[PDB]
Amino acid sequence: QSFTSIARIGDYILKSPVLSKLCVPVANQFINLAGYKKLGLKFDDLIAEENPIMQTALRRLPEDESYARAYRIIRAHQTELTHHLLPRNEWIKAQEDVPYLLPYILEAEAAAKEKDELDNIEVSK
Amino acid sequence: MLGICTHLGCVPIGEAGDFGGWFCPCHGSHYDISGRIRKGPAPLNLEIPAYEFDGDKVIVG
Amino acid sequence: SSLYKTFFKRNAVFVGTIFAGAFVFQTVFDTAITSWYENHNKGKLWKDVKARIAA
Amino acid sequence: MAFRKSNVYLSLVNSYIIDSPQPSSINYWWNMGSLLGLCLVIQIVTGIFMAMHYSSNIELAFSSVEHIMRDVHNGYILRYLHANGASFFFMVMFMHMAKGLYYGSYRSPRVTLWNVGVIIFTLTIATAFLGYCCVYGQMSHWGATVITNLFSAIPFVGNDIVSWLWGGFSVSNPTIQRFFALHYLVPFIIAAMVIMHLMALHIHGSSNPLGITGNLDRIPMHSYFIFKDLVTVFLFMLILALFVFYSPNTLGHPDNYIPGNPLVTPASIVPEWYLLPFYAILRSIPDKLLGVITMFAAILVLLVLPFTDRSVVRGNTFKVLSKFFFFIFVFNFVLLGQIGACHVEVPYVLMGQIATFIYFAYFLIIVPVISTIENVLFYIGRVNK
Amino acid sequence: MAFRKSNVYLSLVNSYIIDSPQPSSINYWWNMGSLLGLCLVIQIVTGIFMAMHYSSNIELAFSSVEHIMRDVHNGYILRYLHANGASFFFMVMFMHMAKGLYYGSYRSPRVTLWNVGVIIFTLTIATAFLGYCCVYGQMSHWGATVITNLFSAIPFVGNDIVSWLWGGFSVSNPTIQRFFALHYLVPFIIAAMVIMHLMALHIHGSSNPLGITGNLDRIPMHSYFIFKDLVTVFLFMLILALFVFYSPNTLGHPDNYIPGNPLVTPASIVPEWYLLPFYAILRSIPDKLLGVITMFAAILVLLVLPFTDRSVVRGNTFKVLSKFFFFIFVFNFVLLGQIGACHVEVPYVLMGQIATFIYFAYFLIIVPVISTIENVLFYIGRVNK
Amino acid sequence: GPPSGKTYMGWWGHMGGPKQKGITSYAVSPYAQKPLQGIFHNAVFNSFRRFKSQFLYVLIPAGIYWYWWKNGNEYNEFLYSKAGREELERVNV
Amino acid sequence: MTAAEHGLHAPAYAWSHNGPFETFDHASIRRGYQVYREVCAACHSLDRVAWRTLVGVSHTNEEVRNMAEEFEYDDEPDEQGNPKKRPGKLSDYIPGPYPNEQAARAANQGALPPDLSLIVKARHGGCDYIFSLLTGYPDEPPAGVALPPGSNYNPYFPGGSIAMARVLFDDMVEYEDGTPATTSQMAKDVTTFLNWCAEPEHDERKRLGLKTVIILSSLYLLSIWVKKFKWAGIKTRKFVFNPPKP
Amino acid sequence: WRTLVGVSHTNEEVRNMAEEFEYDDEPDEQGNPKKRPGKLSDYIPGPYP
Ligand code: HEC
Ligand code: HEC
Ligand code: HEC
Ligand code: HEC
Ligand code: HEC
Ligand SMILES: COc1c(O)c(C)c(C/C=C(\C)CC/C=C(\C)CC/C=C(/C)CC/C=C(\C)CC/C=C(\C)CCC=C(C)C)c(O)c1OC
Ligand SMILES: COc1c(O)c(C)c(C/C=C(\C)CC/C=C(\C)CC/C=C(/C)CC/C=C(\C)CC/C=C(\C)CCC=C(C)C)c(O)c1OC
Ligand SMILES: CCCCCCCC1=C(O)C(=O)c2scnc2C1=O
Ligand code: FES
Hints:
Cofactor (chain G): heme c
Region (Disordered) (chain G): 70-107
CATH superfamily of chain D: Cytochrome Bc1 Complex, Chain C
Order of helices and strands of chain B: EEEEEE
Strand order of the largest sheet of chain D: 1-2
Mitochondrial intermembrane side (chain G): 1-201
Largest interface: A-D, 42 and 38 residues
Number of strands of chain D: 2
CATH class of chain D: Mainly Alpha
Largest sheet of chain D: 2 strands, antiparallel
Distance between the termini of chain B: 12 Å
Radius of gyration of chain B: 12 Å
Strand order of the largest sheet of chain B: 1-2-3-4
Helix content of chain D: 55-70%
Shape of chain D: globular
Bound molecules: heme C, ligand UQ6, 5-heptyl-6-hydroxy-1,3-benzothiazole-4,7-dione, FE2/S2 (inorganic) cluster
Function (chain G): Component of the ubiquinol-cytochrome c oxidoreductase, a multisubunit transmembrane complex that is part of the mitochondrial electron transport chain which drives oxidative phosphorylation.
Number of helices of chain D: 15
Shape of chain B: elongated
Structural class of chain D: mainly alpha
CATH architecture of chain D: Up-down Bundle
Mitochondrial matrix side (chain G): 236-246
CATH topology of chain D: Cytochrome Bc1 Complex, Chain C
Structural class of chain B: mainly beta
Oligomer: part of a larger assembly
C-alpha cells in the first residue's frame, strides 16, 4: 500500500470532526501498545526500505537526520539483543515521533506515478 | 457387491452407520441396505460386479 | 581456579588430551552405569533368577 | 588473502558459514534452519543403513522391518531414530514456517526464498508418506490406497493415472516396490532444493526481529552463531533421545504393527499427527473433487501472503492487531488437528467446517484488512493536520 | 542487464552454459565432457525405473532381473540401456582422460581439476562394480568375493574388515542387499563430485590444442559449442542404439546368465573389459599384498603427472618424442587388456610383467627424461652462442 | 567473473548502509568479565518481563479455542450417552 | 461414539517394568512362557519369536534345546530326493498350532486367533489392555445385550462381542517355581512374557537411554555457558552519539 | 504358458496343454491341501521336485 493512499484516508478522517474524535484516541492507544518508542525508534524508522521509493527518499534526506536515523537503528538492535528496553528517560516522546521521512516518500511517489502516466499516455486526433 | 468405497478406496465396515448398512471409517460415508450412498463424500453406490447363479453357488466374474 | 592452572597453565586443553580423556571416560562411565542399573533392578534380572533355579 | 578466501571450495564455506554477516539482533527463532539441515542428515544416514537390511517385496516388507528391529545390531535404534526423526522434522519445520509468518520473512525481497520453501514442504510431505508406505502395516496400505486415489478426482483420465501409479488392479507388489525406490530418490531432490533455498537467502541475507535493515550492525556467522546453533542442536538431541529410548511408539500408530490386509480397513483410522490438519480439511467438504482441491489449496495459499500483506512495515513485532490474529491462526491450526483425530460426528463436523473457513480467511481477508487498518492507525496517531 | 544475468539461478546457467568464453580453437576431443554428463543421466534414469521392479534378496535378485527382462513393458530396453551404458560410460571416460594426458590438461593451473577427476574415476569403478553384483549371476558372486577379499591384504585387521563387509561368513544375503543400497547411493556422490569438477574448470577455463593462452580470442559457449556438442551427442546415441537393439550381450559375459553358485567358480573367468588392464596388473605379481598394492598404485600414479612433466610448454602438439611415447603408452594399455583376457600361461605372464613395468615407467621415467631432453633441443636449435 | 545483480546487502566494507558518523562504540573483553554467575540478583527480576507484555496475545486466543473445544466435546459425550439419544436423533441426520 | 463401541477403558496397573529405570521381571517372563505353552499355544501362534532368544532371558541354553527338540521341522531332502523331517534346533522359530489360515478358522467358529508376537504393541493400552481383557470376562453379560451365538461378552473389547471365551481359571497351571496360579497371577505373567516378545530390546534400550540422556544433558548445559562467554563482548557493548557539526 | 499364445500355438492349444498338468491350489474351506489343473498364468513344470 502506497503512502499516498495512506495519507488520503488518514487526512479525510483527520479533517472530519466526526471521525477525528472517534479514531485518533484509538490510534494513540495503538501506538503506545506497539512499544517501538521504548526502543528509541520513531515510526518512520520502521518503514521497510528495500524498494526504489524508499531508497530515493533516504538518499534525499539531509545529513543530520540521516546520522540520527543511523544511531537510533543501531541503538535499537543492541537493546533488543540484550532483551531490555531503554531507561524511560531515553524513550522517544510523542512530540519527537514526527513523520520526518514522509514528505520525501510522497514526493518520490508522485514523481514515480507521473512517469508511469506519461509513459502510457494515449493520443486522440 | 464390491466392498470398495467410491470416495478414495477404503473398505466399508459391515453393519454400521446411520442407514442400516455399511460405513467407511476413512472419511465417513454411509451406505444403505442396498449399498447405495446416502451421506458423505462418496459420489456413487457400491459397484455391482458381473455374476451368475448355479444352484447353491454363485460365480463372480 | 588454581586447580586448572596446575595441569594446563593458562592454555586451553589440546585435542590429544581431549581424545585421550574421551577413551578413558567411555569405559569408566559405562561401568558406573551398568553397575547402578543392575543394582537398581536386583531380583528382576536373569542373573538373579538363575540362582533361584537348580537344574 | 587468507586461504579460506582464495580456495575455490573453501570460499563457499567461508561466505556461507564463517564470514557471513548476520544481523546482531536475531533470536533463537533463527536457529530452526540449521536444525532442519541436521534433521535432513539424520534421515538420510539412518535410512541408508536400514536400506541394507530392507526388502521391498510385498510379502517380505513388514517382516524385514521386524528383522531390523530384532536381529540387526542396534537396529531398533536406527528405526526409532528414523521414525521419530520424521516427526521431529515436521515439528521444527512448522516452527521455521511460523517464524517466517510472524516476522514477515516472506516479504520482498525474499519472495523467491519463501516460494522455494513451499516447494520443499511439499517434497517433504511426499517423502514421509512414501516412507510410511514402506512399513506395509495396516495404516500403510490404506494410506497408499487413499493418497493414490486422490488422483482419480481429475476428470476423464483420473482413474487411469491411478491404475498407472499402482502398476495394477490395486495397491500391490508393484506399488510398494516403486514406493521404496521413490522414497530413496526424493530426499536427494530435497537436498538440491535446500541448496537453492540457501542461495536465495545469501543474496539479501537474514531478516531480523525488528523488521528493519541489518546493514548498520552485523557480526560474523563464525563464533557467534556457530556456538549459538550448538545450544539448540544439543537441546534438540536431548528431546529426541527421550522419545527414541523411553517412548519410541508414542508418535506412531498401533495399527502399523499389524501387517497390511487388502480386505479389511481398521475401524478407527488416525493419520500421522502432522497430516491431521489437512485430513480434517479434506473431510469437511461433502464433495469428492472439491474436497481434494481445497486440501491442496490449503498449502498453495501460502504463496499468496506476499501480495495480501498490505502493511508498510515488515513483521508483527510492533503490531497489536496482527499479533492477536496471528495466534488465532496458530490455535485454529491446532484445533483443525484435534478435529482430524475425532470421528465424523455432530459437534465436530461443523467445528471442522468453520475452522477450515477461518484458515483460508486469514490469508485472504483478515491479513489484508487488518494490515490496511494498522497502516492508517500508524499515520493518524502522529500527523497533526 | 538481461534477466539471464540478474536472476540468482539463471546467472549460474548463463555463466556455465551460455556466455562462458571458450577458446576459439578447441576440437572434438573437448566434446567428451558433455558426453560424460549425458552418460551419468542415462545411468541414473534407467536405474531408478528398474529399481521399481528389482528385489535385492539373494533368493530373488537374479529372477527379478529376468522379470525385468520378460514382464516389464520395455524392460529389456531399460536393462540393455543401463548395462551397455556403463560400458559406453568407460569408453568415453578413457578418451576424456587420454585427451587430458595428451594436451597437458593436468598441468598447472588445472591440478585441482585433474585431481577431482581421479576421484570421480575411482567412484565410477566402485559404482559399476556394485551394480555388477546386483545381477547375482556367476560372475557377480565371484567378483563380490574377490573385490571384498582385496581388503584381507591389510595386516592384522584385514580379515575382519572383510567379514564386516560381508555381514557374515561369506558373500550372502547381507552382502548383495547392502551392495544394492550402496549402488543407489554412490551415483549421487559422483554428481556432487562432477559439480566440484566444473567449479574448478570455471576458474581458469578450458585449455586448447595449441597449449597456449586462449585469452586473446574467445567465442561464447552459446550457439557455437551447444550445437557442436549436439553433433557428438547424436553420434553417441546412434552407436549405443546399435548395441542395445542389435547386439545387447556382446559386451557382457554368458556366465552372468547363470545364477550365482557358492560352491563352483567358472572354469574361465574374464572380468568386465574396462577392468581387464587392472586385472592383468594384479595377476602379474606373485605376492598377495604386493599384488593389490601395485594395482591400486596403477590408478594413484595419475596424481604424479603434474610434477614429473618437466616440459616448459603444455601438451604434445609440437613434441616429436612425446607424441611417439604417448602412443606407446596407449597401446601398452590395450595390450595389458588383451593379456587380462588370456590364461595365466607362458608367453603371456612375462608379457604381462613387462607391460606393467612399461605402464609405471611412463609416468616415473619416460616423461621426465623425454620432457627434459625436449626442453634442451628446443633451446640449442635457435640460440647462436 | 560475470556481472552480478544489485541486492540490498553487500559485504564487509561495503555493506550497503548509510554513511555513519558521530557514533562511538565501546566494549570489554569477555576474558576480563565476571565469570558467568552474575546472571542473578541483577538479572532475574528483569527477566520474565518479555512475556508479561506478550502472554495476552497468546492467552486470549488460546482461551477462546480451549473453551470452544471443551464445549463441543462435552456436547458430543452427552449426545452419545443414554440421556441424549433423543436429541441425537434430532441433530444427527 | 457409544461407550459399548469404543470399549471400556483399561485402567493403569503398576507393572514392575513401568518407569525409565526399570527392567522386565525375568521370573515373570519365565512363568508367562509356561502359561503360553500350556494354555494359549493351543490357538495362538508366536511366529516372530526364535528359540535362541529365550536363552539367557527366561531359560537356560539346555532347557531351550530340550523344548525345541520336542517339535519337528522340514529338513533338507535326502540323497534320493524324498522329503524328511528333523527335530528342532535353536535357530528355528516357535511353531504354531495351525498349518494355514483356513484350518485356524475351522477350529474357531470361523474366527482367526491373531499371532501374539507383537500384540502388546499392536493395541492401544498395551499391557493394561491385554491383562484387563483376560481377567474381565463377567459370568453373565449386562441386561439387554443380545449376544450372538458362539460369541462371548467382554467390556474391554470394542463392541463387547469377542470370539474368544474365558480360558484362564484358577489353578489350571502348576507353576514350576511354586507360585499360586490364580487367574490374575497368570494373566499378569503371560502379558509380561508377551511384552518381552514384542520388545525384546527393552532392558538394554533403557540402559543405553540412561547413558545417552546424561551426556546430552551435560552437553546442553555446557554449551549455554560457552555461548554466554563467547557473547559477553557484544552483550555488554555500549554506544554514544555526538551529532556531527555541519 | 501364456507366452506361447500367439507365438507358436493358439490360445486354445496352450490351454489344453497346461491343463494336462497339476499344480498346488489354495487350501479348501477346512485347511486340507488340494490340487488343480493348469492355467495360462502358470509356468511350464519340470521333471524333478
Ligand atoms: C482358542 C480356544 C484360544 C485360546 C486357548 C486363547 N485364545 Fe486368544 N483368541 C482366540 C480367538 C478365536 C481370538 C479372536 C477374537 C476376535 O473376536 O477376533 C483370540 C484373540 C485374542 C487376542 C486379541 C484380541 C484383540 O484385542 O483383538 C488376544 C490379546 C488374545 N486372544 C490373547 C490370548 C492369550 C494371552 C491367551 C492364553 C492366556 C489366549 N488368548 C488363549 C482364541 C483363543
Ligand atoms: C533408503 C534411504 C532412505 C532415505 C534417504 C530416507 N528413508 Fe525413510 N525409510 C527408509 C526405509 C528403509 C524405511 C523403512 C524402515 C522404517 O520403517 O523405518 C523408511 C521409513 C520411513 C518412514 C516410516 C517410519 C516408521 O514408522 O517406520 C518415514 C515416515 C520416513 N521414512 C521418512 C523419511 C524422511 C522424512 C526422509 C528424509 C528427509 C527419509 N525417510 C529418508 C529409507 C530411507
Ligand atoms: C537404483 C538406481 C540406480 C542407479 C542410480 C544406477 N544403477 Fe546401475 N543398476 C541398478 C539396478 C536395479 C541394477 C540391476 C539391473 C541390471 O542388471 O541392469 C543395476 C545394474 C548395474 C550394472 C550391471 C549391468 C548388467 O550387466 O546387468 C552396472 C554395470 C551398473 N548398474 C552401472 C551403473 C553405473 C555406472 C551407474 C551410474 C553412474 C549406475 N549403475 C547407476 C540401479 C541403479
Ligand atoms: C515455507 C517456508 C519455508 C520452508 C518450509 C523452509 N524454509 Fe528455510 N527459510 C524460510 C524463510 C522465509 C527464511 C528467511 C528467514 C528470515 O530471515 O526471516 C528462511 C531461512 C532459512 C535459514 C536461515 C536461518 C533461519 O532459520 O532463519 C536456513 C538455514 C533455512 N531457512 C533452512 C531451511 C531448510 C534446511 C529447510 C527444510 C528442509 C527449510 N529452510 C524450509 C522459509 C522456509
Ligand atoms: C582423470 C581425469 C578426469 C576425469 C576422470 C574426469 N575429468 Fe573432466 N576434465 C578433466 C580435465 C583435466 C579437464 C580439462 C580439459 C582441458 O581443458 O584441457 C576436464 C574438463 C571437463 C569438461 C570440459 C569440456 C572437456 O571435455 O574438456 C567437462 C564438461 C568435464 N570435464 C566433465 C567431466 C565429467 C562429467 C566426468 C565424469 C563423470 C569427468 N569430467 C571426469 C579431467 C577429468
Ligand atoms: C543467513 O543465515 C544463516 C545461514 O546462512 C546458515 C548457512 C546457517 C547454518 C545452517 C546450515 C548451513 C544448514 C545447512 C544444511 C545442509 C547443506 C544440508 C545438506 C544436506 C545433505 C543431506 C547432504 C547429503 C549427504 C550425503 C550424500 C552423505 C550421507 C551418507 C553417507 C556418509 C553414507 C556412508 C556409507 C558407509 C557404508 C560408511 C544459519 O544458522 C543462519 O542463521 C542466521
Ligand atoms: C569450459 O568448458 C565447457 C563447459 O564448461 C561445459 C559446462 C560444457 C557442457 C557440458 C556439461 C554442462 C555437462 C554437465 C553435466 C551435469 C551437471 C550432470 C549432473 C548430473 C545429474 C545426474 C543430475 C541428477 C538428476 C536427478 C536427481 C533426476 C533424474 C531422475 C528423475 C527425473 C526421476 C523421475 C521419476 C518419475 C516417477 C517420473 C562444455 O562442453 C565445455 O566445453 C568447452
Ligand atoms: C497434504 C496431503 C495430506 C494427506 C491427507 C491424507 C490423509 C489420510 C487419509 O485421508 C486416509 O484416509 C488414510 S487411511 C490411512 N492413512 C490415511 C491418511 O494419511
Ligand atoms: S474412502 Fe470411504 S469415505 Fe473416503
